[PDB]
A paper describes a structure:
In the first step of the HP, [name] synthesizes d-glucosamine-6-phosphate (GlcN6P) from l-glutamine (l-Gln) and Frc6P, releasing l-glutamate (l-Glu). [name] contains two domains: the glutaminase domain responsible for releasing ammonia in the hydrolysis of l-Gln to l-Glu and the isomerase/transferase domain, which catalyzes both the isomerization of Frc6P to d-glucose-6-phosphate (Glc6P) as well as the transfer of ammonia to Glc6P to produce GlcN6P. The active sites of the two domains are linked by an ammonia channel, which forms when [name] engages with both of its substrates, l-Gln and Frc6P. The main distinctive feature between prokaryotic and eukaryotic [name] is the feedback inhibition by the HP product UDP-GlcNAc, which inhibits the glutaminase function.
As a negative control we generated a [name]-1 variant that prevents UDP-GlcNAc binding by mutating Gly461, which is located at the bottom of the UDP-GlcNAc-binding pocket. Kinetic measurements showed that [name]-1 [name] has similar kinetic properties like wild type [name]-1 for l-Glu and d-GlcN6P synthesis. [name]-1 [name] did not respond to UDP-GlcNAc treatment, as expected from the crystal structure.
Numbering used by the authors:
A (entry chain B): 2 to 227, 244 to 293, 308 to 681
B (entry chain A): 2 to 227, 243 to 294, 301 to 681
The structure:
């Protein structure tokens, strides 16, 4: 889901400049939800913009944002030339996880057939059914099945029973949130409060951008309780940008005000009051010269790996320092167990580093899927160190596992790629993988950056063990050489594309690996599932003989991973078993693995690295393969079907 | 792959009776798989059996045992009526490793063209290359491409180079095994030791059955190192011995067996059984196994039998352990260790395949009732990572066979680090049941089918019973324990209720008959049900079935759902019900039309879902047993519809080395 609104106060914008700003704001947020979209602006065709704020127009349509961009245009009733000196427009892209992604279920919702109050909502109201029966008995009719409509039909109920003729828009919103349960990030608009916007949040992101050629009256808005507002000093020119993400606002200004839970922001008379510089460059959210975000993010891994280690890894003296842990590493080493909790590819990053964490810490290491971790009420203890891997820092199950472990007194550590996220804030300490914004739905650099981050932690946990000095040096030299080796893998892009032309027509593919490459075959199978829609499955190589090997014949595509580590011989037995079953597999192996290369037709030869880093090099070909397969099948790699990025609700 | 030898000592048997006994023995060993079989016995047609001892006859053939039985009676020079007061016959089914299947590569392997020594072998001699070069340099010509022939040629080399004319058959074999490297189970026969047998093993099962109408000298054979120290009938000579690599070949003649251990050399000399080794001893123990337990009966396949007899195998697993009169649990196998176990700080379950799924299926209740960390590891990955293990860990090893290599090596790994080891096995005398500090035999009866059906559900019940032991002193858990135990009391009848829906499963099998993939989705107690169901359909049906954790759909796998991909969802009445419904709304929202396995009374889902398999409600931590059975049957029926032999093992090892 995504939220974006544009409030231009005494900065004249025509109706086309606003609609093109609402759509352009949703395009920056489309990667969070692309099942439907909508916009809410002022209607009417009066040359005097003042006589139009009493008419709200809603243009909602099913599909991505490009389906709404064309629905907004070529309309016969909306004159796009009216100049508005003061105007508020709200927009929203929706991730329809339930029901149909129809225009009636898309946002902004409405409170009646005349649009007196329209709201855009990100989250879930855990008591909308009770609010739907109370509002229906008073005389309100419902049109949609979404839980957002109960917020629109309720802000009007507080307006129809107010005590004074001029109850501020904040008071109406404050009474609403008091009746809403669960999480929500809202942005209201009403004809009765022209140009006024109200932004409240609870368990969901919501910031407010500001731009103005004049000086701002302060840089610390004081929270109020039922010399106070943020506004231009001498003049009135100001532009606000409500949004649930920082990408929809960086293009216009890098000055935002990250709200907090229960903070009811409100723009009145062009002044921002709360009741109760961004460190990002636009180039980071631009595809550049690549045709897709995913392809850029795969080919930027040489850089993102370097950024993850910047200011943390010194190769002249072989020292590792994660500043985020400087005030806890001592207490972390007196703990007795590591628990890694995450979902999806973040969980695979844990599987990919579990062995080296066990090796260098000598502690038990338990890697848990967040959803199952919660279902079982897993035992947690005060001397447990619990890591929570989340590219977004907002994943529902991972965040709930965090609060679960905090309640039991465990030491909590956040491995995130989003500063200010829930997981990064609520953990005792934090490590920011610093991989840059990830716009593609599939995690590519986030995986390898989480990988490297956990290896760097492992290197801190053994920096006082004489017997492990050489092992640490081996690994750090591998990290020094890792960016260049990633480039070597990317230079085989064309070779991967050719092998993809031999598989795009297949329905299934088994990816097999063990040891350090169990995670590789799991993550590779998830990528091929997510963007290619082929039935790809990861199979632990050691488990073939126990049943799954029966599925292999000359028709079943197979990809195997055979690297030069301590499992090489065992991986050769699995390969011999596959061949005996008439399998003709593609083997990802080391360049110097002459034996494997001679006896196998299709081989992807990757350069050798340290055994505990090879997983980074062996997964990249499967990222590229998934990409090429998706292209061959006519799919879009930046907008896979049936889901979006970051699972923040239930 | 299968060994069987029958030694009748002063128990008269005709040649026909001996050969019928050997053939019958191999028939109990076919269920594993094989490519060739053979027998070795005394030739010659002299009416006096004493003179026929210097003529060993061999009949080996590539094919099934039935073809061998036809070749036995199809011998024009052989008289089947000669009566032998003393005779040793050996038989073998082969699973070719070194050398292609053929008569020459079949066992018994001989030491020369006159059959002075013959040997049947299960396993692989790793150093068969070096040994072959040595014996060839001494003047021994080989005729087969098997590693086994080196054993036959080597024992003759020891005989030819013996120091005294009366060196014992044992001493020769001792010198042979001292040069062998690898795994083996061996039975020797020779004209120079008429009527004598020598059996030895290293890393491969070998047992000895005994029968006599006369009292035996002992039930504990003492080991002899290099009249009161061997096993024999006391007042008379008559006795029968049965060497075998699987008790299934012995149980119809006797239930008194001796399980040999690595490097034991058991010898029968003058009808007396001794056990040599370069007060320790081997016990004569009684097996509770019955011939009926390894027969199909009225069922058309072992897979069908073992699925439909699960009401009975569940009861056997609980027999003598769960008291439904005062609701108590007692696992006698743990009596001398339960106190140390409760002072430990972590449970680790280590297994492969379906045994591993049994750990996943009971992890939550073990966590709930023990309140200890519970870690469930795949044995192969457990070894690759060198997982940290400590002296206060309790490590469980789940293995129907008790011989799985990675699980066994995980056991030895954990023993080296001082952990308390517990075996959950279905095979008396197996490696894991022995080497563990204690065990809990699951008592499900033998599993003859290729896939694990009753073994899974009996392991499931066994770990629940252990969980109930670990909390029998907690006041706050008395209610929960009673609930679980009333569920176990009602479980056999609920399994029958599920088996009565077999017709509903067949209908689903015809709907998936033509399908290439199917996603099986579940969470919580039914995560394991997904993994186990998907493995069964992979193993038995050969279609791409995959178990997906329902909570992980939104993180990528949901992209496979459309109007074409078959989906099976498991939704039960437990604390994860609302979350399972949400996963169902996500699947449907993406044009998915899934089959839902749910509770009988879940009226909401039954109306909103077209096809639903409606299983009866049980305790939440027991539902996995009921909801997996429809998936067992589904795999079975799909296979039948597609013309597959469900009792045929398609999983073959690496190719045969031809050299
Ligand atoms: O390709 C991976 C997907 O993007 C998805 O599997 C993702 O990894 C999880 O949803 C966890 O995301 P977070 O790291 O933000 O928690
Ligand atoms: O369908 C299950 C198969 O029979 C297989 O998965 C089995 O579970 C193990 O591979 C063998 O291990 P154990 O003999 O130790 O159980
Ligand atoms: N390795 C021996 C015996 C194999 C077996 O049957 O266990 C052979 O190939 O003949």
């Amino acid at each position: 889901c995504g939220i974006f609104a544009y409030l231009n106060y005494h900065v004249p914008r025509t109706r086309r400049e606003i609609l093109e700003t609402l759509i352009k704001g949703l395009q920056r947020l489309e990667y969070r939800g692309y099942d439907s979209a909508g916009v809410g602006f002022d209607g009417g065709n009066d040359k005097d913009w003042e006589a139009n704020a009493c008419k709200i127009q809603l243009i909602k349509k099913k599909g991505k944002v490009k389906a709404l961009d064309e629905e907004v245009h070529k309309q016969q009733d909306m004159d796009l030339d009216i100049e508005f000196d003061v105007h508020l427009g709200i927009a929203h892209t929706r991730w329809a996880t339930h029901g149909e992604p129809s225009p009636v279920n898309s946002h902004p919702q409405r409170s009646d057939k005349n649009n007196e109050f329209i709201v855009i909502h990100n989250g879930i109201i855990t008591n909308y059914k009770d609010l739907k029966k109370f509002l229906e008995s008073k005389g309100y009719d419902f049109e949609s099945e979404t839980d957002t409509e109960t917020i629109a039909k309720l802000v009007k109920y507080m307006y129809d029973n107010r005590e004074s003729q001029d109850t501020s828009f904040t008071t109406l919103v404050e009474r609403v949130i008091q009746q809403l349960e669960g999480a929500f990030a809202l942005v209201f608009k009403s004809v009765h409060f022209p140009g006024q916007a109200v932004g409240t949040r609870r368990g969901s992101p919501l910031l407010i951008g500001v731009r103005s050629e004049h000086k701002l009256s302060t840089d610390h808005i004081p929270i109020l309780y039922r010399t106070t507002c943020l506004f231009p000093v001498e003049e009135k020119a100001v532009e606000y940008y409500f949004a649930s993400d920082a990408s929809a606002v960086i293009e216009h200004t890098n000055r935002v005000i990250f709200l907090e839970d229960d903070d009811v922001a409100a723009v009145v008379d062009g002044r921002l009051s709360i009741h109760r510089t961004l460190q990002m460059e636009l180039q980071q959210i631009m595809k550049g010269n690549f045709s897709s975000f995913m392809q850029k993010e795969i080919f930027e891994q040489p850089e993102s790996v370097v950024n993850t280690m910047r200011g943390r890894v010194n190769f002249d003296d072989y020292t590792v320092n994660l500043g985020g842990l400087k005030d806890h590493i001592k207490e972390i080493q007196r703990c007795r167990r590591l628990i890694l909790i995450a979902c999806g590819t973040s969980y695979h990053a844990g599987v990919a580093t579990r062995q080296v964490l066990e090796e260098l810490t000598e502690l038990p290491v338990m890697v848990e899927l967040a959803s199952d971790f919660l279902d079982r009420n897993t035992p947690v203890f005060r001397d447990d160190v619990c890591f929570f891997l989340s590219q977004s820092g907002e994943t529902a199950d991972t965040l709930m596992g965090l609060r679960y472990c905090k309640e039991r007194g465990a030491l909590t550590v956040g491995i995130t790629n989003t500063v200010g996220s829930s997981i990064s804030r609520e953990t005792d300490c934090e490590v920011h993988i610093n991989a840059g914004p990830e716009i593609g739905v599939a995690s590519t650099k986030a995986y390898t950056s989480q990988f490297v981050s956990l290896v760097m932690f492992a290197l801190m946990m053994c920096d006082d063990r004489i017997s492990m000095q050489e092992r640490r040096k081996e690994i750090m030299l591998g990290l020094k050489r890792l960016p260049d080796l990633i480039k070597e893998v990317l230079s085989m892009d064309d070779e991967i594309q050719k092998l993809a032309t031999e598989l795009y027509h297949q329905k299934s593919v088994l990816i097999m690996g063990r040891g350090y490459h169990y995670a590789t075959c799991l993550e590779g199978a998830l990528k091929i599932k997510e963007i290619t829609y082929m039935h790809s499955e990861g199979i632990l190589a050691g488990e073939l003989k126990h049943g799954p090997l029966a599925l292999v014949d000359k028709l079943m595509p197979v990809i195997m991973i055979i690297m030069r580590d301590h499992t090489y011989a065992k991986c050769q037995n699995a390969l011999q078993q596959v061949v005996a079953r008439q399998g003709r597999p593609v083997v990802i192996c080391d360049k110097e693995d002459t034996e494997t290369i001679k006896n196998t037709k299709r081989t992807i030869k990757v350069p050798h690295s340290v055994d505990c880093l090879q997983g980074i090099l062996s997964v990249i070909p499967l990222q590229l393969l998934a990409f090429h397969l998706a292209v061959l099948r006519g799919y879009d790699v930046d907008f896979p079907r049936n889901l979006a990025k970051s699972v923040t609700v239930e």
